[PDB]
Design a binder for these strands. Structure first.
Ligand SMILES: [Zn+2]
Ligand SMILES: [Zn+2]
Ligand SMILES: [Zn+2]
Lengths: 53, 26
DNA sequence: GGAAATATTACC
DNA sequence: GGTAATATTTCC
């Protein structure tokens, strides 16, 4: 059980909680090199990259 | 994504994800 | 094991 | 169409 202190939600692991806490901090460490859009996750930046083609 | 919902046509990588999803139509 | 990636979902 | 978020699965 890996609960967020700011909201009640729990997460399967500590990294999952880490990823979730970015919804509170606005941390978005994954930045598209083509347009500069920032993402909380590498998976989402990855998907976003296919929109440039 | 070989697993197709015969209600809404969405494809899914595994039959588990399709099974999970088919409940949304109940 | 848990981090990381992936798949999916909820939105609009 | 493409985000934002997370559940599920994959991977060292
Ligand atoms: Zn939270
Ligand atoms: Zn971009
Ligand atoms: Zn369906």
């Amino acid at each position: 059980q890996h609960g967020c202190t700011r909201c009640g939600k729990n997460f399967s692991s500590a990294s999952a909680l880490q990823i979730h806490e970015r919804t509170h901090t606005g941390e978005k460490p994954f930045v598209c090199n083509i347009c500069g859009r920032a993402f909380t996750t590498k998976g989402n930046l990855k998907v976003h990259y296919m929109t440039h083609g | 994504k070989p697993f197709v919902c015969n209600i809404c046509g969405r494809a899914f990588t595994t039959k588990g994800n399709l099974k999970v999803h088919y409940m949304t139509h109940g």
